[PDB]
Write a protein that binds this ligand. Structure first.
Ligand SMILES: Cc1ccc(O)c(NS(=O)(=O)N(C)C(C)C)c1
Lengths: 237, 300
């Protein structure tokens, strides 16, 4: 069944699962032509495939060349996503393959199901949650590797840095979703929060700053303020 | 012209013969149906006046034997049987005709409805969908489930329709995932037509039989099967032109014959709106689209 508020703790049990977000696979800028018509120019995208228990992120970079000469790109993007996820699963040892794949958008269900026909025991699940994974391209190191890519490429990250040494995966995922929600609602403010205190650096092998436990509580508070604020600045409350 | 004799009518029942029907009262002197057109399969079907639950009936072809109906008071239903003694049978029928205790198959001369509904339906194919090889005729009722329903429980009493599943390895070539899912022509033309049915006539025969079981017995799995076979054609970009023209005629007469008051349960909104307005064949079913729009505009 669908993944929602009520079965959120299932994300952190010992059954391997992956979130798949396709919202940054097909990315375009819209511009005017010399004749005054409108056209798109594709830019590099990425599939965001995340193990929420371990933080392992399989970032499949989608190079603009995959769109060359193709029609109905937004539809193709869903099938390309499903093909790459299926290829990823097939590349993993049997004991690392997921038991469930949760897609963040319902339009991915049929493409993924058809591509995973060889894996009848892998459950493909939607979610009722409005998850903020689109904001992954607001993480500077992820954005940089996607935009610099000259060819299709898979890059492996741990999106939790070393947090699991000190917190649970429930707490890690909740922190991640809070950071990404903040970045999605007001990227500039969210980014000011994370970096303005300059003494707290980002290790070369990390994505986020090296906050202490205490500093994370302050940061998380500031992100929650941000999200409520922007909710007022938007709704006038 | 052929005849199906009834030994008697001990319980009040509505008796159908193809698209016709009449009410027989308890112990009314009714002894069967005469003047049945030769050349077509036929169905004789029953709904008891006390228990409208379970419509049931028999598909048969008078060319394949002499058949009659006799009520079984133990199993509680009208059973079809074969009379192997031809002389006895002609004699029985002649006596009942002389006493005018039979209804006449009430076919209007101009009317091709039954031909149009059974054009591709053959007894031999019916008997492979309804397995009961000791009889020349086939029993069907409202509750029988299909082999595909049983996969998702008594196999001897199943409707062995050809399984169609759009999200299945049979339907989707490795490496053609998107292509084959969005354009089912491979599955229609190679897998089903060339591979399984052999020709479009057998495909249409199964489609027509499924519709008729849905209409006459309210058989839900048959309705699923009918819509699946329609959708498979409509979702194929590449269909022989003769098949599309024949499909339009087939569906036209099915929609024309459907009791107006059963459309809500027997017509799947999604399939029909998809087939008539979104599918590759949205422009290829002119007669069917016109009758659907004038008779069931609400569904659409
Ligand atoms: C109606 C019909 C057709 C075929 C049959 O064999 C029978 N058997 S019988 O009902 O025993 N019968 C010979 C008559 C008295 C009627 C009846």
């Amino acid at each position: 069944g669908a993944m929602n508020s009520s079965n959120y703790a299932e994300l952190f049990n010992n059954d391997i699962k992956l979130f798949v977000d396709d919202t940054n696979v097909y990315r375009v800028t819209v511009h005017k032509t010399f004749e005054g018509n409108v056209a798109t120019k594709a830019i590099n995208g990425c599939i965001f495939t995340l193990n929420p228990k371990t933080g392992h992120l399989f970032l499949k970079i989608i190079h603009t060349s995959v769109w060359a000469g193709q029609k109905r790109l937004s539809q193709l993007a869903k099938w390309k996503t499903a093909e790459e996820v299926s290829a990823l699963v097939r590349s993993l040892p049997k004991e690392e393959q997921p038991k469930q794949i949760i897609v963040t958008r319902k339009a991915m269900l049929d493409p993924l199901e058809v591509h995973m026909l060889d894996f009848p025991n892998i459950a493909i699940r939607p979610t009722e949650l409005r998850l903020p994974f689109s904001a992954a391209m607001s993480i500077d190191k992820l954005s940089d590797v996607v935009m610099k890519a000259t060819e299709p490429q898979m890059v492996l990250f741990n999106i939790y840095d070393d947090w699991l040494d000190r917190i649970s995966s429930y707490t890690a995922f909740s922190r991640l979703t809070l950071l990404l929600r903040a970045l999605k609602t007001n990227e500039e403010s969210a980014k000011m929060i994370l970096l303005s205190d300059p003494t707290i650096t980002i290790k070369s092998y990390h994505l986020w700053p090296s906050f202490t436990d205490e500093q994370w509580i302050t940061i998380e508070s500031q992100m929650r303020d941000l999200i409520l604020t922007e909710y007022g600045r938007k709704y006038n409350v | 012209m052929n005849t199906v004799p009834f030994t008697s009518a001990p319980i009040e029942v509505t008796i159908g013969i193809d698209q016709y029907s009449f009410n027989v009262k308890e112990n009314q002197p009714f002894h069967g149906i005469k003047d049945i057109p030769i050349g077509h399969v036929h169905v004789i079907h029953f709904q008891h006046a006390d228990n409208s639950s379970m419509r049931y009936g028999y598909w048969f072809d008078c060319r394949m034997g002499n058949f009659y109906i006799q009520y079984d008071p133990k199993d509680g239903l009208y059973k079809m049987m074969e009379e192997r003694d031809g002389a006895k049978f002609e004699n029985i029928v002649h006596n009942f005709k002389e006493r005018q205790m039979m209804v006449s198959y009430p076919k209007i001369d101009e009317d091709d409805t039954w031909y149009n509904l059974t054009e591709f339906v053959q007894m031999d194919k019916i008997r492979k969908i309804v397995r009961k090889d000791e009889n020349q005729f086939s029993y069907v009722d409202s509750s029988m489930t299909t082999v595909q329903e049983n996969e998702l429980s008594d196999p001897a009493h199943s409707l062995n329709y050809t399984v169609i599943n759009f999200k299945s390895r049979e339907a989707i070539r490795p490496g053609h995932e998107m292509e084959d899912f969005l354009d089912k022509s491979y599955y229609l033309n190679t897998v089903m037509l060339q591979g399984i049915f052999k020709n479009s006539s057998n495909y249409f025969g199964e489609l027509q039989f499924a519709f008729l079981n849905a209409m006459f017995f309210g058989n839900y799995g048959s309705s699923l099967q009918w819509h699946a076979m329609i959708e498979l054609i409509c979702s194929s970009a590449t269909v022989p032109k003769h098949m599309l023209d024949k499909l339009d005629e087939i569906l036209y007469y099915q929609i024309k014959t459907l009791p107006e008051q059963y459309s809500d349960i027997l017509l799947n909104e999604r399939v029909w709106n998809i087939c008539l307005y979104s599918s590759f064949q949205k422009n290829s079913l002119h007669n069917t689209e016109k009758i659907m729009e004038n008779k069931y505009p609400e569904l659409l």
